[PDB]
Amino acid sequence: SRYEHIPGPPVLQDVFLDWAKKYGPVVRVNVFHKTSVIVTSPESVKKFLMSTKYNKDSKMYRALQTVFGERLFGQGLVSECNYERWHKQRRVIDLAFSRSSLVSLMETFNEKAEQLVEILEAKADGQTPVSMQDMLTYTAMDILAKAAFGMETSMLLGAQKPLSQAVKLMLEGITASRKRKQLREVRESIRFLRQVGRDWVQRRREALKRGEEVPADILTQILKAEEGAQDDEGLLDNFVTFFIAGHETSANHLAFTVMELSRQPEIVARLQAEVDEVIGSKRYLDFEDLGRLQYLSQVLKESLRLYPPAWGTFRLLEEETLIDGVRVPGNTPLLFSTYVMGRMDTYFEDPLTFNPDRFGPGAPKPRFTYFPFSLGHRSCIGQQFAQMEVKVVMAKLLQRLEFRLVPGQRFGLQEQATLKPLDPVLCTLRPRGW
Ligand code: HEM
Ligand SMILES: CC(C)N(c1cccc(-c2cnco2)c1)S(=O)(=O)c1cccc(Cl)c1
């Protein structure tokens, strides 16, 4: 009753879209364990996301914190809702994301991209069906394992199959929580990953004790953040956090892009020409090269408009407030969705048209209607890491390979925590040059 006055009805994100179009910029939803309000006006996006006065709603994030009694993200960097505790760990971990820290990862990005491309080249008979979803997540996993934790997962070599099963099952579990054997598998998956965390953490401390060389990475900084804890629960919270966040959304984004570009030959031909002109025959992309891939840069932005893996963020409204002419009571979770806003014609002309020119220099920039890495103090720490990562992978693909989506492969979405292609993005492949 306390929310009955708010406009509302008497893939779920598409229902959110229908509701936003039908009911306006402030709509109540009852799908989560708590009534919440989805807010889709730019003014509100700006007001709520671009302020330190508004914090994440812990009731909504507890779904990431613990899954079916089993601690997952805990109080790591994504799911920590206390400002003081968040701010402390953010600033320590920030160091691993400095310009120079990121620049030094170019070798890892290039190596794993080059491995992927050679693996695909060997299958490029225009006949063999290849799951680009699988191949791209293997690549994202291998990049992250090495870049963040100094570990070689070798998923591109077909290793660590149990590990990717664990990730899959726990992600499905986050959404499902919104029988007997599903719960068992999910719980086991979560514990498996935290145990992997302990393993790799042990390996690092031992490396350190034996006075071996340890490059400064994300793991260095999540250890620094926990210098005087009474246990390793915070450490493992952050391990899991970065282990998942550090590859899942990147994988989703890559898969979405390849899927869409597979029906955009004109754009692909343009992307192919850009890559040819800037890197040439080179096998390695420098940092400075990434900047000159302007058209690919725009393509990836447009891919994030239509297909954002991270679809929602929540803030706690503490005091009753008027939001776009709607009275919203105090203690209410507010939902912000780049997915919904990206598909609204009031925000984007022909919203379902894939046009990279929307992000061309001299194009009017989306003013608070596009936020695939969110906005304000709780924006993605991994944003530049991701942008560089996916540019390197995409550029090597485009340099070397032609992709054709196997007929019957759908363009639909599925929700497994984040949004990703429903289908495995099966493609046949041919080398460039006939
Ligand atoms: C295309 C790839 C990526 C997308 C679209 C993306 C999107 C987002 C979004 C929307 C948030 C806000 C979360 C929230 O409001 O609850 C976020 C935060 C975060 N992302 Fe990402 N992300 C990406 C890649 C990465 C990478 C590569 C890393 C790690 C290397 C990462 C780690 C994080 C972390 C730790 C946070 C929490 C930051 C904080 O609150 O201080 N993400 N990301
Ligand atoms: C914006 C967040 C909370 N989402 C999300 C989830 C997992 C990893 C990442 C991530 C961020 N950076 C890298 O990975 C982002 S989500 O939108 O998928 C989501 C999922 C479940 C419930 C909700 Cl409410 C939202």
Side-chain angles (χ1 to χ4, degrees):
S1 178
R2 93 179 289 237
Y3 291 109
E4 75 181 314
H5 68 283
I6 294 181
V11 158
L12 174 79
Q13 292 74 24
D14 291 302
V15 176
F16 284 176
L17 172 69
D18 294 350
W19 289 350
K21 283 154 74 169
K22 177 168 181 187
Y23 292 108
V26 180
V27 182
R28 68 144 195 293
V29 293
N30 292 250
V31 283
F32 302 104
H33 273 114
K34 197 182 185 199
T35 314
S36 76
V37 163
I38 181 168
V39 170
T40 56
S41 91
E43 302 75 15
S44 296
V45 175
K46 169 180 167 184
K47 179 174 172 166
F48 291 109
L49 298 189
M50 297 300 294
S51 179
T52 67
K53 310 287 271 179
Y54 300 105
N55 302 309
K56 282 184 185 183
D57 197 311
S58 53
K59 286 165 195 159
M60 305 311 293
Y61 280 97
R62 75 85 191 125
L64 294 183
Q65 293 176 353
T66 294
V67 186
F68 302 129
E70 213 53 80
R71 183 176 183 159
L72 185 64
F73 285 76
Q75 305 305 125
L77 190 69
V78 171
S79 47
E80 176 54 76
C81 293
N82 172 272
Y83 179 81
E84 331 146 38
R85 288 174 277 191
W86 162 78
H87 196 195
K88 181 200 150 183
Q89 54 177 301
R90 176 64 188 249
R91 293 284 304 185
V92 162
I93 303 174
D94 272 340
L95 273 50
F97 287 97
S98 77
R99 173 75 94 78
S100 53
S101 287
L102 291 197
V103 164
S104 73
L105 290 186
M106 281 299 301
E107 178 64 28
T108 304
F109 292 162
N110 271 281
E111 278 193 20
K112 298 309 168 76
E114 180 53 42
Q115 186 180 19
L116 170 66
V117 155
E118 290 180 6
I119 287 162
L120 294 180
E121 273 173 346
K123 299 177 184 299
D125 57 3
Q127 176 183 310
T128 295
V130 177
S131 170
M132 293 301 296
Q133 179 154 58
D134 286 343
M135 289 307 297
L136 290 169
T137 112
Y138 297 162
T139 301
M141 180 58 89
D142 286 357
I143 290 169
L144 189 272
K146 176 60 181 182
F149 310 112
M151 293 294 311
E152 290 291 350
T153 41
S154 296
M155 288 207 86
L156 279 176
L157 291 188
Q160 298 288 346
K161 287 287 168 280
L163 181 63
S164 62
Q165 287 314 123
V167 167
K168 168 180 168 295
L169 278 153
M170 61 186 108
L171 286 183
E172 296 175 11
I174 293 173
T175 297
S177 65
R178 195 192 63 181
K179 175 183 160 62
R180 285 137 284 284
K181 189 189 172 183
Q182 200 197 132
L183 257 59
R184 270 280 28 111
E185 286 180 1
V186 168
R187 288 174 188 170
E188 181 50 68
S189 289
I190 294 158
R191 286 188 308 254
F192 181 75
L193 184 71
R194 288 188 82 82
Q195 188 54 50
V196 166
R198 295 184 227 257
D199 294 347
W200 296 7
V201 160
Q202 173 177 92
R203 275 154 158 163
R204 175 68 57 103
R205 285 169 170 160
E206 290 193 296
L208 277 171
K209 293 221 80 197
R210 284 213 299 288
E212 299 195 311
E213 192 188 80
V214 292
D217 57 10
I218 291 165
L219 178 64
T220 304
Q221 299 302 129
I222 79 178
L223 281 160
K224 192 81 165 171
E226 277 274 297
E227 269 218 0
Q230 264 289 356
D231 55 37
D232 289 322
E233 289 311 84
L235 176 60
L236 296 173
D237 289 354
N238 264 327
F239 175 93
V240 174
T241 295
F242 282 82
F243 187 89
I244 298 170
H247 92 282
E248 185 62 34
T249 48
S250 300
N252 298 161
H253 179 30
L254 284 168
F256 273 131
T257 306
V258 170
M259 174 197 81
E260 181 64 46
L261 286 180
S262 82
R263 64 170 168 188
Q264 301 288 347
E266 305 104 303
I267 291 162
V268 163
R270 293 182 190 287
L271 288 170
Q272 283 173 348
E274 181 171 77
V275 156
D276 288 357
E277 293 306 300
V278 313
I279 64 174
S281 62
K282 291 202 298 166
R283 305 172 67 65
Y284 188 89
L285 272 83
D286 306 320
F287 183 67
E288 52 175 359
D289 284 345
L290 291 183
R292 306 180 185 116
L293 296 169
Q294 180 49 57
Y295 189 66
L296 170 62
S297 166
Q298 301 174 195
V299 163
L300 293 164
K301 281 180 191 179
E302 179 67 349
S303 176
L304 286 177
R305 181 192 68 76
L306 251 195
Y307 299 119
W311 55 261
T313 190
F314 285 98
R315 299 288 183 281
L316 175 67
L317 182 81
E318 284 175 57
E319 317 208 304
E320 182 181 68
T321 304
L322 191 75
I323 312 181
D324 280 280
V326 181
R327 180 174 68 71
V328 193
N331 197 182
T332 301
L334 300 183
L335 170 63
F336 305 83
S337 184
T338 190
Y339 180 88
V340 172
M341 279 182 91
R343 286 169 183 255
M344 276 169 91
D345 20 271
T346 82
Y347 303 124
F348 295 100
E349 334 52 61
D350 307 300
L352 299 183
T353 296
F354 185 84
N355 186 4
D357 292 348
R358 291 182 207 263
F359 292 97
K365 278 164 171 51
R367 201 214 156 130
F368 295 102
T369 55
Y370 170 78
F371 45 103
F373 297 97
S374 192
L375 292 163
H377 71 287
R378 296 308 287 279
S379 70
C380 185
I381 200 188
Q383 180 179 346
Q384 287 64 46
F385 178 118
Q387 294 181 305
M388 286 163 69
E389 187 184 11
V390 314
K391 277 204 207 189
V392 169
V393 172
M394 284 302 308
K396 299 194 64 59
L397 291 184
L398 288 161
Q399 179 175 46
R400 301 275 280 276
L401 289 167
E402 295 164 355
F403 297 86
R404 272 191 42 76
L405 191 70
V406 170
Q409 290 290 288
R410 296 165 289 184
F411 291 80
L413 272 59
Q414 68 179 303
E415 178 194 4
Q416 310 300 351
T418 65
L419 291 177
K420 67 207 69 185
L422 173 65
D423 266 344
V425 192
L426 281 197
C427 296
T428 60
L429 281 83
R430 291 285 199 176
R432 288 194 57 209
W434 213 60

